[PDB]
């Protein structure tokens, strides 16, 4: 089983001896510090609260386990057994902590308080920052959700421009990232964050996470269709690629099907195999069951353009009301290699310059979507801003001489709407003056209980783009 | 409850219908495909085999769960209920798969077969690639271990050059990455991979993973010491940084202690607080209990060099036998901000140019060590190379016209020692010709059972640097 006493950075085990004597309160906050990605989607804390922080998280056995581990790890007895004992005895092992947070799905500009943490019992002043490590991992679903939303903005802009509407936008970026992330747990968290913005995923782990921790009215939050991989093509033998294609599209004749087409020669496959030998099997398909051709190698922009060029000459292309070229409805393309936020932009802009509608294409992204992200992207950070020592509150902060970007906020914080309807974080307990309407932070956790929860439907509503509003 | 029927890429649910009819065997392999990182440390498969693949992994309940999920996810019944039920009924839910692998800890040049997978029952031809997704996640511990070892090579070169030995090498790169990875599970996996090469870690999750899945003779594989964070300094108030410093070093007077010193002004902290006001509390400390000063902001190289110059004028510096400057034994530095393999190289070279021994310094790395890595780095990839259809074996491969780097290997594979003692991968079943001696892969998994495994001590031995060996 998971042991919260072993789920912190080692050095934090020693911090109870380092704070000022007579400290009864340590109050800390999380922000995506201002330093590109001007606003972030707050998502993922509810998962952490439920899986790791709520209920009886301290037991006699867990305390002894930690004591034994830290004895060897530090070669010294430094572990605060007395402090953990107190929580076990007084609170039946529930954490005396209060966390207040902005609603999940909320889109907030950089440099604003997103959640705060403080101890509710003076004996547990040390506990606030014990749980920094576990809480800071919220950086990941925040960053995946944010980066996914930024790609949706790019897709929406170009889809609207080239088609006149946003039909199909929520299926334009498919999660291919299950194999490319660092763990099973990561896969679930990351896939769920992408699903805040889109509905197409192959990362099955995301579905179970959403069902367990968030919930949706619909049976599932994400969908897929039958699709080939290189192995189901190559297994037929080099000389039988056409037989593989024919078998697969016939097996899946009445649903959408994606067929990876670059095993040997993507251009030959498009022009000769799909475009001639098997054309009769494609032009007969329903609009609700297109063939989706999938290139998977070469320069992503150059390959997409060449594939469209080939297909446009073998299949009947129309010109939409915006003046952009459109493949027949039984034929589409998905580019699922080398896609990240930067290359996505390059591809849709290249398509627009060549007069191809974004209606023609969808994207798959794996490592770019779920793995190629760090805590530095949005500067997700947790800092102490207020302590009470000898009954007096003190506003505290860091402000390193050589890096003003690392200065932290001072005092008790609150988040408010400005008169123009934007966001502002008030420092130094100024929220108490009541000049800025209600605090947007809500208590979500208190003394071992989750006190406020959001459904996945609510989160999706909060995270909507302006364009779709 | 983890459910292997829900632990694959969605599209793989539909693949059993796409293979050629009457296919009885699918054989696939994993490599770090050849495209800075010329050799890789193979590590992490044993964790995956034990946690996720071994024993009864299929139950009636798990089949029903998967059936219900995929029905909604595909809006259709496409899920191979019959195929999974066959495994349940015939093998008590144990996977009819055989996996052969190179020993864990082995250091192997890019483009070699690292492991192979095939089904052991013709009915389960579809199972080989079902588990691609979960096995390909081995990229992560491989890549962490490899990148960590590459940093160790850099540290060894400069430590040897500036000091004449490698004392302390295994504590030169400390894992600070627990908060900066994407999940608790990732933290344990990544931290364990770093511990293949080093012994200093704050990512506690790695200890329990190693103990459970690998094992060591020592009670724990990794160690740490008391250390401050910004909150334990700043909580004292801006005008009381000296009081914080004094309290902390007095609390930890007889063990090593690291104190973050850049809350307000690192240069003032070093020159005036440590170098003057509290100097008497530092020069009194044991060699076994140094103050370790931690800067955490600014240009990493410029800041390290300036901190060292400041301390060198406030404390007695010696010149070691190699001609490099050395702080007294009660005083050291750790640079734990902005460290990745690139900036590490830059810092130690900069120190060498300014005649400072690498003995003076250690590094902490967080996101750079455990998170800022992708499957692309070593091109970790799983591909089908051999199938049997209608009783005929076929050597299969991809070879995309626009990217020769993505060409995959053909046929049955084996790994061998060359006459010069290097590794070579033989394709097309040619290992059977016996011109290259025995296959170096070992069967590690067969029909639900782990059949070969390695202790963490063995893995560490396999992963040693040549310079450590010599
Ligand atoms: C559900 C609905 C019918 C609306 C639909 C959703 C999504 C698409 S799509 O074209 O955006 N994506 C379908 C798809 C699914 C999986 C794969 C695929 O190749 N997945 C995969 C997974 C992991 C690694 N590599 C590839 C390709 C296309 C089409 C229709
Ligand atoms: C165990 C032994 C006595 C040999 C030893 C090991 C390692 C060092 S070290 O100086 O390489 N590292 C000690 C250390 C530990 C933790 C921190 C620290 O600040 N950790 C931390 C963790 C997470 C985030 N940020 C910082 C700093 C120095 C010194 C002695």
Return d(Cα B421, Cα B427) in angstroms, integer. 19
Are A390 and A408 within 8 A, CB to CB?
A: no
Residue (of B309, B305, B306, B311) closest to B291 by Cα position: B311
Q: Do A384 and B234 lie within an 8 Å CB cutoff? A: yes
Report domain A137-374+454-469's class. Answer: alpha beta
- Count Cα neighbours of A138 within 13 Å in the Cβ-side half-sphere: 28
Are A25 and A125 within 8 A, CB to CB?
A: yes
Residue A156 dihedral angles phi and psi, to the nearest 5°: -65, -45
The token pair that represents B69 in the structure block: 């999920």
Are B408 and B385 within 8 A, CB to CB?
A: yes
Return d(Cα B336, Cα A214) in angstroms, integer. 37
The token pair that represents A209 in the structure block: 């996470």
- Altogether, the residues listed in chain B come to a count of 470
CB-ligand 2 contact for B181 (6 Å cutoff): no
Residue (of B180, B204, B224, B196) closest to B362 by Cα position: B224
- Altogether, the residues listed in chain A come to a count of 469
Residue (of B390, B452, B389) closest to B26 by Cα position: B389
Return d(Cα A128, Cα A118) in angstroms, integer. 5
Are B312 and B325 within 8 A, CB to CB?
A: yes
Return d(Cα B100, Cα B28) in angstroms, integer. 11
Residue B324 dihedral angles phi and psi, to the nearest 5°: -100, 150
Element at A361 (helix H, strand E): strand A361-365
With beta carbons under 8 A apart, name residues in chain A contacting B147.
none
Angle between helices A341-353 and A300-314 (to 10 degrees): 40
Residue (of B305, B400, B299, B295) closest to B351 by Cα position: B305
Q: Based on the number of CB atoms within 10 Å of its own CB, is B358 exposed (0-12), middle (13-18) or buried (19 or more)? A: buried
CB-ligand 1 contact for A295 (6 Å cutoff): no
Q: Based on the number of CB atoms within 10 Å of its own CB, is A71 exposed (0-12), middle (13-18) or buried (19 or more)? A: middle
Distance from CA of A118 to the nearest CA of B (A): 13
Are A216 and B6 within 8 A, CB to CB?
A: no
The token pair that represents A36 in the structure block: 């590109």
The token pair that represents A283 in the structure block: 């032009």
Residue B261 dihedral angles phi and psi, to the nearest 5°: -120, 10
Grouping H, G, I as helix, E, B as strand and the rest as coil, residue A269 is: helix
Q: Which residues contact B85 (CB under 8 A, 6 or more apart)?
A: B63
The token pair that represents B370 in the structure block: 């455990």
With beta carbons under 8 A apart, name residues in chain B contacting A262.
400-402
With beta carbons under 8 A apart, name residues in chain B contacting A299.
402
Q: Do A20 and B247 lie within an 8 Å CB cutoff? A: yes
With beta carbons under 8 A apart, name residues in chain A contacting B399.
263-264
- Residue A442: beta bridge partners? A101
Distance from CA of A73 to the nearest CA of B (A): 5
Experimental resolution (Å):
1.7
Q: How far is the CA of B331 from the centre of ligand 2 (A)?
A: 14
DSSP state, residue B283: T
Q: Which residues numbered 85-104 in A keep a CB inside 8 Å of some CB on B?
A: none
Instruction: Render the burial of B433-469: b for 16+ CB within 10 Å, e for the rest.
Output: eeebeebbbeebbbebebebbbbbebbbebbebeeee
Residue from A7, A9, A406 to probe ligand 2 pocket by mutation (most atoms less than 8 Å from CB)? A9
Q: How far is the CA of B229 from the centre of ligand 2 (A)?
A: 11
Breaks (C-N over 2.5 A) in chain B follow: 35
Residue from B231, B291, B364, B366 to probe ligand 2 pocket by mutation (most atoms less than 8 Å from CB)? B364
Return d(Cα A290, Cα A293) in angstroms, integer. 9
Return d(Cα A443, Cα B114) in angstroms, integer. 50
Strands ordered across the beta sheet of A361-365: A173-175, A361-365, A331-335, A291-294, A257-260
Q: Which residue of B has its CA nearest to A201?
A: B10
Are A39 and A127 within 8 A, CB to CB?
A: no
Q: Which residues contact A106 (CB under 8 A, 6 or more apart)?
A: A41, A42, A440, A462, A463
Grouping H, G, I as helix, E, B as strand and the rest as coil, residue A280 is: helix
Q: What long-range pairs does B83-87 form, CB within 8 A, spacing at least 24?
A: B83/B16, B83/B123, B83/B124, B83/B126, B83/B127, B84/B5, B84/B58, B86/B123, B86/B124, B87/B58, B87/B124, B87/B127
CB-ligand 1 contact for A364 (6 Å cutoff): yes
Flag whether residue B367 sits within 8 Å of chain A, measured between CB atoms. Answer: yes
Residue (of A208, A214, A193) closest to A140 by Cα position: A193
Q: Which residues contact A456 (CB under 8 A, 6 or more apart)?
A: A195, A196, A210, A214, A215, A216, A221
Grouping H, G, I as helix, E, B as strand and the rest as coil, residue B113 is: strand
Return d(Cα B63, Cα A247) in angstroms, integer. 27
Rg over alpha carbons for chain B, rounded to the nearest Å, is 26
The token pair that represents A250 in the structure block: 């016939």
Q: What angle do CA A248, A251, A255 make, to 5 degrees?
A: 100
Flag whether residue A207 sits within 8 Å of chain B, measured between CB atoms. Answer: yes
DSSP state, residue A20: P
Return d(Cα A312, Cα A408) in angstroms, integer. 56
Return d(Cα B218, Cα A417) in angstroms, integer. 56
The token pair that represents B412 in the structure block: 């049955």
- Count Cα neighbours of A370 within 13 Å in the Cβ-side half-sphere: 34
Residue B97 dihedral angles phi and psi, to the nearest 5°: -135, 145
Residue (of B456, B414, B449) closest to B98 by Cα position: B449
Residue B326 dihedral angles phi and psi, to the nearest 5°: -135, 125
Q: Which residues contact B434 (CB under 8 A, 6 or more apart)?
A: none
The token pair that represents A163 in the structure block: 């088609």
Q: Which residues contact B218 (CB under 8 A, 6 or more apart)?
A: none
For domain B137-374+454-470, say whether CATH 3.20.20.70 is its number: yes
Grouping H, G, I as helix, E, B as strand and the rest as coil, residue A266 is: helix
Q: Specify binding-site residues of A.
A: 179, 202, 230, 294-296, 336-337, 367, 375
- Cα–Cα distances (Å) from B198 to B148, B172, B177, B461, in that order, read 8, 8, 14, 12
* Nearest ligand for residue A12 CA: 2
Residue B293 dihedral angles phi and psi, to the nearest 5°: -85, 130
- Residue A423: beta bridge partners? A417
CB-ligand 1 contact for B18 (6 Å cutoff): no
Q: Which of B47, B69, B231 should one mutate to test binding to chain A, selecting the residue with the greatest count of A CBs within 10 A?
A: B231
Return d(Cα B83, Cα B15) in angstroms, integer. 12
Element at A235 (helix H, strand E): none
- Residue A396's Cα: distance from chain center in Å? 31
Q: Do B11 and A72 lie within an 8 Å CB cutoff? A: no
Q: Which residues contact B165 (CB under 8 A, 6 or more apart)?
A: B159
Q: Based on the number of CB atoms within 10 Å of its own CB, is B309 exposed (0-12), middle (13-18) or buried (19 or more)? A: middle
Flag whether residue A231 sits within 8 Å of chain B, measured between CB atoms. Answer: yes
Are A158 and A348 within 8 A, CB to CB?
A: yes
Calculated CA dihedral for residues A64, A65, A68, A69, nearest 10 degrees: -150
Q: Based on the number of CB atoms within 10 Å of its own CB, is B198 exposed (0-12), middle (13-18) or buried (19 or more)? A: buried
Calculated CA dihedral for residues B124, B125, B126, B132, nearest 10 degrees: 110
Q: What are the domain boundaries of chain B?
A: 1-136+375-453, 137-374+454-470
Instruction: Render the burial of A388-399: b for 16+ CB within 10 Å, e for the rest.
Output: bbeeebbbbbbb
The token pair that represents A213 in the structure block: 């921790």
Distance from CA of B23 to the nearest CA of A (A): 9
Residue that the structure tokens 């504590």 belong to: B171
Q: Do A190 and B181 lie within an 8 Å CB cutoff? A: no
Calculated CA dihedral for residues B145, B148, B153, B156, nearest 10 degrees: -120
Q: Which residues numbered 401-420 in A keep a CB inside 8 Å of some CB on B?
A: 401-403, 406
With beta carbons under 8 A apart, name residues in chain A contacting B230.
383-384, 398
Beta-sheet strands, E only, within B266-306: 291-294
Number of helical H runs and strand E runs in chain B? 17, 18
Return d(Cα A4, Cα A17) in angstroms, integer. 19
With beta carbons under 8 A apart, name residues in chain A contacting B384.
230-231, 234-235
Residue (of B141, B151, B146, B206) closest to B173 by Cα position: B151
Rg over alpha carbons for chain A, rounded to the nearest Å, is 26
Return d(Cα B140, Cα A242) in angstroms, integer. 36
Q: Looking at the partner chain, which of B7, B9, B222 has a beta carbon nearest the beta carbon of A184?
A: B7
């Amino acid at each position: 089983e998971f042991n919260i006493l072993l789920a912190t950075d080692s050095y934090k085990v020693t911090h109870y001896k380092q704070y000022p004597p007579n400290t009864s309160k340590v109050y800390s906050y999380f922000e995506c510090r201002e330093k590109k990605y001007e606003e972030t989607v707050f998502y993922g804390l509810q998962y952490i609260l439920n899986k790791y922080l709520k209920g009886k998280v301290v037991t006699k056995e867990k305390i002894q386990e930690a004591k034994d581990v830290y004895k060897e790890h530090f070669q010294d007895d430094v572990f605060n057994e007395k402090g953990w004992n107190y929580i076990l005895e007084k609170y039946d092992g529930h954490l005396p902590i209060e966390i207040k947070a902005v609603p999940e799905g909320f889109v907030i500009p950089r440099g604003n308080v997103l959640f705060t943490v403080e101890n509710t019992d003076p004996e547990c002043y040390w506990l606030t920052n014990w749980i920094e490590t576990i809480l800071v991992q919220s950086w990941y679903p925040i960053t995946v959700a944010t980066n996914s939303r930024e790609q949706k903005k790019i897709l929406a802009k170009y889809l609207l421009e080239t088609s006149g509407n946003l039909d199909g936008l929520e299926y334009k970026l498919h999660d291919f990232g299950y194999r490319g992330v660092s763990s099973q747990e990561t896969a679930g968290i990351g896939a769920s964050a992408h699903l805040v913005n889109f509905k197409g995923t192959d990362t099955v782990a995301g579905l179970a996470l959403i069902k367990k921790y968030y919930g949706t009215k619909d049976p599932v939050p994400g969908y897929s269709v039958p699709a080939a991989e290189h192995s189901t093509i190559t297994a037929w033998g080099k000389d039988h690629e056409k037989d593989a294609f024919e078998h697969i599209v016939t097996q899946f004749s009445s649903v959408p099907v994606s067929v990876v087409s670059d095993s040997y020669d993507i251009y030959n496959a498009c022009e000769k195999i799909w475009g001639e030998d098997l054309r009769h099997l494609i032009v007969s398909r329903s609009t609700q069951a297109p063939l989706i051709i999938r290139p998977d190698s070469g320069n992503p922009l150059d390959t997409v353009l060449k594939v469209l060029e080939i297909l446009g000459k073998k299949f009947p292309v129309t010109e939409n009301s915006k003046g952009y070229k459109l493949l027949p409805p039984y034929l589409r393309v998905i580019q699922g290699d080398g896609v990240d936020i930067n290359t996505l932009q390059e591809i849709v802009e290249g398509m627009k310059q060549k007069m191809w509608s974004i209606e023609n294409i969808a994207f798959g992204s794996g490592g770019g979507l779920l793995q190629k992200l760090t805590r530095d992207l949005l500067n997700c950070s947790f800092k102490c801003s207020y302590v009470v020592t000898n009954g007096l509150g003190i506003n505290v902060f860091k402000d390193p001489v050589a890096d003003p970007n690392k200065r932290s906020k001072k005092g008790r914080l609150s988040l408010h709407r400005t008169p123009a309807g934007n966001f502002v974080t008030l420092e130094e307990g100024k929220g108490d003056l009541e000049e800025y309407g209600q605090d947007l932070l809500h208590t979500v956790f208190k003394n071992g209980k989750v006190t406020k929860s959001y459904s996945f439907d609510e989160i999706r509503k909060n995270a909507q783009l302006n364009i779709e509003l």
